[PDB]
Amino acid sequence: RMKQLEDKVEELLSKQYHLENEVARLKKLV
């Protein structure tokens, strides 16, 4: 079922952006 899969993608993809910038923030401090 497409929309849920489609939904899960848009879901994962946003967590990815938030983790990515976290690291980035962490690298400075360290």
Next chain:
Amino acid sequence: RMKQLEDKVEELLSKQYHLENEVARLKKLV
């Protein structure tokens, strides 16, 4: 197309994991 959507979710989990590992590494770092 479904199998495409399916593969995208799977590829995104692998990125996510790598990411959490890193953020962890970076955490100890503090």
